Design a binder for this molecule. Structure first.
Ligand code: SF4
Ligand SMILES: [Zn+2]
Ligand SMILES: [Zn+2]
Lengths: 171, 714
């Protein structure tokens, strides 16, 4: 919302900040009033670049920095790969070496051509999915579930503490 | 004067000691013999330092192996200067007694800003600026370039110190800060680094808390060398607040914008470095793979690996992501939100920033920023603050909390929101001191009752004794006035604050007390806004003009320059027969910094019990967490915070040399048993039921009579 305005229609960005960026394969600071303008003609084409889009390639995002928008979306996609837990590797260096390669992949995708990254990702898809990728999908789902359970346990304990001290006072 | 203490024989410079001094020395010797941390209170502002220092020196002589050295800390450098003066006098006395020099060293540490000899940094007074300039001059890059001896300003003092002081340490002696500056000038060495090295072999070292509490700078000079040392904190009743401040980090919108600009400059500098010199500075990557100071204490700090951030670009992107998350989280407009662990979890989920890589953020910032050969760290200081916050949050949140304030107090609508990371318990940050050092003595004056302190700070005290000053004459005659001439309650309650009758009672009491009291009087209010409201009411009425006629009136303001000018004029007014009435705030920095002595602040007036506003959400976390853990009632802790502050701001008049003076508290709340009980023992025992709730007129009459009694000689 801190951006000066859209490259084309920098108006709404001044009147109100309600508009949120729209991510695309192009990687852009697109705005809803401008998304309508893209829908009317082209229907999934970047105005200046002209990059084709299958179905408008539009998804909501909330950060004034377009570079952060693209980086966060690319990282979201990448996290689906190389999600194996650290303890799977006993080697000290290998704990974060693969994370280094992951972030290198992210930076490569942000600016440089993604053809090599896609070919490499196909290679990692075939070799790792056989066993480890689906296993770590399961384990990360388990840890998400148990963290939401633990936060609800914390909030049950806080509600019980509030209501029991109230019943202390009234009793 | 050699005192045959029960433990041993202890020298003493002055001729006579009061029985309270005997009690202090015996209790202190008991604690040292037990070799266990403890806390004790002594009334006198001065005299306690000499007794403590003499006992510690005698104990060191008797059992040198038991205690390696003494680490005596004081609130402020102007105060610690008086301590070094006392130590110098004691050493001169002992040296005269022995007839020869002994291998004893005593020194005081202080900031490079306070003491330094470089003309370039001399004109600048801002501490971050001095730190950055000194880092630039002493940088490893500058040292290597000095080896080349190219045409460039190089700070010769550090180089000469490295050449000479490394080989030869200072034999012995006592050096004040000012005298150490002269020694550094004469020897072409650093008064700072020379003392830093002497810490390795020094019998006595003195420096303020922020040199011994904050893990960033405290640890480096408080390394494990002093495994068994007598660490002592003087007048450290406000130790919890400073220990919390050593951890709390405040993030603001302006600071975040400055961080973003600094980060842009960092990126540009990285590009320039890549195009100019790349391989030599890339060797940093190799040493990183092998594996401003970190805020993580000894055991909490970790150095396994930097993490996923292994290159300049990767680290820069990580900081960009975290800064964007903080920016948005702060921009959100809503009620105050608290989230110690939920903040970390939400950060990791929303922006994909794992806590383990986030942990080493500040350390990797230090290393990478060093690689960049920046001009100075002053420009990038906001980024380092944000990095310290980023590493701290990922380090721990069990006894912490992140508070967000989209709207600031005293402003219906302001575009400068603030994110606080205020701590809740000081035990977390003060644990290393207690654990590392065999025994710590928290010697304090005006101490609110000791029982609370073990609860707030997790330690097992050895002795719990309150020492009462005993003199042939009643130096202090405190009183509490709750009933005015109208026989109306004068409590300064929030709902009763607006009461014009109460304000009038305060004004009339001040008028009469200024009429009778001799030159020099200080009145402490509860807040700036309350003080201004009372002053305005008195101005609308004729009371204020009469007070002005009777005696000069000075007022305190938030601005330090005006505060200093007003206090400077107040001192001259006290010296002259005009007199002065200094209105100030209990929480004001002036109240804690200033010390009142004979013919200074003769009658200390306390207008209302000092209570912090019940809306500041930081205190809500700090207080409800104490209720949940350590089991302290909210009202108990609030009244303790009021009584400790009042004792701090009212205990100055009895500084030393047996200078008479009266402490009047114009509030019926102090008459309550709980307030009296929590009041320090020495003041309370002097206080009696006869004068507990004197009317305004009766208090004035008894004050006049007591001043008559104290006027005559011994
Ligand atoms: S190296 Fe020594 S003399 Fe030079 S600026 Fe730093 S403290 Fe001052
Ligand atoms: Zn637009
Ligand atoms: Zn485009």
């Amino acid at each position: 919302m801190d951006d000066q305005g859209c490259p084309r229609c920098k108006t709404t960005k001044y009147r109100n900040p309600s508009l949120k960026l729209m991510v695309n394969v192009c990687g852009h600071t697109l705005c809803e009033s401008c998304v309508d303008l893209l829908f009317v003609r082209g229907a999934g084409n970047c105005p200046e670049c002209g990059t084709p889009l299958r179905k408008s390639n539009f998804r909501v995002q909330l950060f004034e920095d377009p570079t952060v928008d693209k980086e966060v979306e690319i990282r979201k996609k990448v996290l689906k790969i190389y999600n194996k837990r650290e303890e799977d590797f006993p080697s000290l260096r290998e704990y974060n070496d693969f994370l280094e390669e992951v972030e290198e992949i992210v930076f490569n995708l942000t600016n440089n051509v993604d053809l090599d990254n896609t070919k490499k990702k196909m290679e990692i898809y075939q070799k790792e999915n056989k066993d480890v990728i689906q296993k770590n999908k399961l384990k990360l789902t388990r840890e998400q579930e148990e963290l939401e359970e633990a936060l609800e346990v914390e909030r049950q304990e806080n509600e019980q503490r509030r209501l029991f001290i109230q019943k202390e006072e009234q009793l | 004067m050699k005192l045959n203490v029960d433990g041993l024989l202890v020298y003493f410079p002055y001729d006579y000691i009061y029985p309270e001094q005997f009690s202090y020395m015996r209790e202190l010797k008991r604690t040292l013999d037990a070799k266990g941390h403890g806390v004790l209170e002594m009334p006198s502002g001065t005299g306690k330092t000499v007794s403590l220092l003499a006992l510690i020196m005698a104990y060191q002589r008797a059992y040198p192996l038991e205690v390696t050295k003494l680490i005596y800390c004081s609130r402020t450098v102007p105060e610690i200067e008086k301590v070094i003066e006392e130590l110098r006098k004691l050493l001169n006395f002992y040296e005269k007694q022995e007839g020869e020099k002994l291998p004893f060293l005593g020194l005081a540490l202080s900031s490079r800003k306070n003491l330094c000899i470089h003309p370039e940094v001399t004109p600048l007074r801002f501490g971050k600026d001095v730190d950055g300039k000194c880092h630039s001059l002493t940088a490893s890059y500058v040292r290597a370039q000095y080896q080349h001896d190219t045409s460039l300003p190089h700070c010769r003092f550090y180089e000469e110190f490295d050449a000479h002081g490394r080989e030869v340490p200072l034999p012995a002696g006592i050096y004040n800060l000012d005298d150490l500056k002269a020694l550094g000038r004469r020897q072409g060495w650093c008064p700072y680094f020379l003392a830093r090295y002497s810490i390795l072999h020094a019998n006595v070292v003195v420096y303020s808390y922020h040199y011994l509490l904050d893990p960033k700078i405290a640890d480096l000079v408080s390394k494990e060398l002093a495994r068994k040392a007598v660490v002592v904190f003087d007048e450290a009743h406000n130790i919890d607040n400073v220990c919390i401040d050593s951890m709390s980090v405040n993030l603001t919108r302006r600071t975040l914008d400055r961080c973003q600009g600094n980060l842009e400059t960092l990126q540009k500098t990285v590009l320039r470095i890549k195009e100019t010199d790349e391989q030599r500075l890339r060797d940093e990557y190799r040493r990183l793979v092998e594996g401003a100071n970190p805020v993580l204490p000894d055991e909490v700090l970790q150095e396994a690996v930097p993490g996923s951030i292994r290159t300049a670009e990767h680290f820069l992107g990580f900081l960009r992501r975290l800064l964007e998350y903080v920016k948005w989280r702060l921009r959100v407009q809503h009620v105050v939100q608290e989230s110690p662990p939920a903040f970390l979890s939400g950060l990791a989920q929303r922006v994909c920033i794992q806590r383990k890589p986030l942990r080493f953020c500040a350390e990797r910032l230090r290393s990478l920023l060093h690689t960049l050969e920046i001009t100075d760290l002053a420009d990038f200081s906001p980024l380092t603050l944000l990095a310290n916050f980023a590493t701290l949050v990922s380090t721990y949140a069990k006894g912490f909390t992140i508070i967000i304030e989209p709207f600031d107090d005293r402003t219906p609508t302001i575009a400068n929101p603030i994110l606080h990371f205020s701590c809740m318990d000081a035990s977390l940050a003060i644990k290393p001191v207690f654990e590392r050092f065999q025994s710590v003595i928290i010697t304090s004056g005006t101490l609110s009752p000791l029982d609370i302190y073990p609860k707030i700070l997790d330690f097992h005290p050895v002795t719990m004794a309150t020492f009462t000053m005993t003199l042939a004459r009643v130096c202090l005659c405190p009183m509490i006035i709750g009933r005015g001439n109208d026989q109306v309650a004068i409590s300064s309650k929030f709902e009763t604050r607006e009461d014009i009758a109460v304000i009038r009672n305060y004004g009339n009491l001040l008028l009469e007390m200024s009429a009778v009291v001799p030159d020099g009087i200080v009145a402490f209010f509860t807040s700036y806004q309350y003080m201004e409201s009372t002053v305005a009411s008195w101005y609308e009425q004729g009371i204020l003009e009469n007070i002005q006629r009777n005696k000069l009136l000075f007022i305190e303001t938030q601005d330090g320059a005006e505060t200093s000018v007003a206090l400077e004029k107040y001192q001259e007014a006290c010296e002259n027969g005009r007199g002065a009435i200094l209105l100030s705030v209990a929480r004001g920095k002036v109240s804690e910094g200033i010390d009142f002595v004979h013919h200074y602040g003769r009658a200390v007036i306390m207008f209302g019990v000092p209570y912090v506003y019940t809306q500041s959400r930081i205190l809500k976390a700090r207080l409800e967490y104490l209720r949940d853990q350590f089991q302290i009632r909210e009202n108990d802790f609030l009244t303790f915070d009021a009584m400790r502050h009042a004792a701090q701001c009212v205990g100055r008049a009895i500084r030393g040399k047996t200078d008479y003076g009266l402490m009047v508290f114009a509030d019926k709340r102090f008459a309550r048993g709980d307030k009296r009980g929590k009041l320090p023992r020495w003041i309370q025992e002097h206080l009696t039921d006869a004068n507990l709730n004197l009317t305004v007129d009766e208090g004035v009459q008894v004050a006049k009579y007591f001043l008559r009694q104290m006027a005559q000689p011994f």
